[PDB]
Amino acid sequence: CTFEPAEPKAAKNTYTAERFIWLTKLNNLRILEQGSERPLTDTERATLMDEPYRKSKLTYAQARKLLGLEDTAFFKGLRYGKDNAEASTLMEMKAYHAISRALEKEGLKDKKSPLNLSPELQDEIGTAF
Amino acid sequence: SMFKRAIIFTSFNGFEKVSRTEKRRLAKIINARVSIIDEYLRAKDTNASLDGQYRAFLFNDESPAMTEFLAKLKAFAESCTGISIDAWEIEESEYVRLPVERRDFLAAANGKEIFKI
Fold this sequence. Notes:
This is part of a larger assembly, with chains A and B.
Chain A: H1 15-28, E1 30-33, E2 37-39, H2 42-49, H3 51-54, H4 60-67, E3 73-75, H5 94-104, H6 119-128
Chain B: E1 4-12, H1 20-33, H2 47-50, E2 53-58, H3 65-80, E3 83-87, E4 90-91, H4 92-97, H5 103-109, E5 115-116
Antiparallel strand pairs in B: 1-2, 1-3, 1-4, 3-5
Helix pairs in contact in B: 1-3
Family (chain A): Belongs to the CRISPR-associated protein Cas9 family. Subtype II-C subfamily.
Protein name (chain A): CRISPR-associated endonuclease Cas9
Subunit structure (chain A): Monomer. Binds crRNA and tracrRNA.
């Protein structure tokens, strides 16, 4: 692991790993409004935190809707010259939704009902598969 | 005589395509409450008006209309598997004091959560 030599490095498709990716993006995501830069307030982060699980993908424009961001407020780390750039993904929990779609498609999960499996169990499924 | 405002934000969650019929249903639900007083937040059936929109309805506490409306909303949300409704609640005392700039968002953060579905 280079952090815990006894333990191995593992499992991108993992609640813990996907959540690491998500939190790294969210914590590093800053919005530039015409003028200067600023990072998301704690209420904004709290608002966005659970949306990658609730929706299929948290689109950048979709994030603008959630925050009532109001054009003249643009995302940094986003090529805004390209047209309809805000259809970019910004985050997709591939593993969580892969497990959820598998269960949904076979009759064990009520679609759009949160996956009740534990983070431990999700990590285990990711590592095993 | 205390005015609670129910802030409801409607999002399109992707899991399924959204039947034109469901858009008409939700538009009927939302537009039942609207009057010339709040001709803003009139609900169309197009995605642009139903997807990713905050609407703050004014209700009067000690009146059973707020609860019935929110129950109808919750029932539709439970039914529609592909539309997600978020409800909050704020007293108008605090609501009016916010800066108009993005009031509904702020009211959502500063307000009592009701149901997320």
